[PDB]
């Protein structure tokens, strides 16, 4: 507190940490979704939800409490009978198309990362990226 708050030593991992740059020497960070245990758990939860959704009845109308103003005469069709059925179908199908969304997302991410050094200014303009792109084109 009173004295120098840094106290650099000859470790370079405490020295780098004390000045802010700690994770900046590792390739990729540490995350939670990278373990098979959490993956199995998430898959279990998703399968349970899909099971519950599929065990619903097909005839799943909804009484909307605003049908009062629509003077239904036992022959007309209520304009809101399919509102919980539509939501159930939407959730079920969205849960069944998860891998497709994952694939499209990873395609987008890869095709936007591969062009980082060409589309992002502060990466394209550093002397090191420019030097590397020049070094590749040496005839």
């Amino acid at each position: 507190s009173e004295k120098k708050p840094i106290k650099i030593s000859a470790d370079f991992n405490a020295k780098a940490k004390s000045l802010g740059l700690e994770s900046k020497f590792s390739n990729a960070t540490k995350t939670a979704l990278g373990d098979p245990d959490t993956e199995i758990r998430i898959s279990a939860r998703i399968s349970n939800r899909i099971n519950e959704l599929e065990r619903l009845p097909a005839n799943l109308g909804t009484y909307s409490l605003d049908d009062c103003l629509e003077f239904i005469t036992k022959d007309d069709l209520s304009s809101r009978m399919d509102t919980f059925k539509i939501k159930a179908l939407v959730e079920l199908k969205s849960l069944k198309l998860l891998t497709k969304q994952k694939s499209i997302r990873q395609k987008l991410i890869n095709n936007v990362a591969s062009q980082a050094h060409h589309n992002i200014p502060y990466l394209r303009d550093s002397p090191f990226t420019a030097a590397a792109q020049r070094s590749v084109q040496i005839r």
């Binding site: 708050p5 000045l19 802010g20 740059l21």
Partner: peptide, 20 residues
Amino acid sequence: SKLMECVNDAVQTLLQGDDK
């Protein structure tokens, strides 16, 4: 990494003055 923000602000204030 919060100390370096104060350090940068101090250096900028140094650049603001003349007889410093």
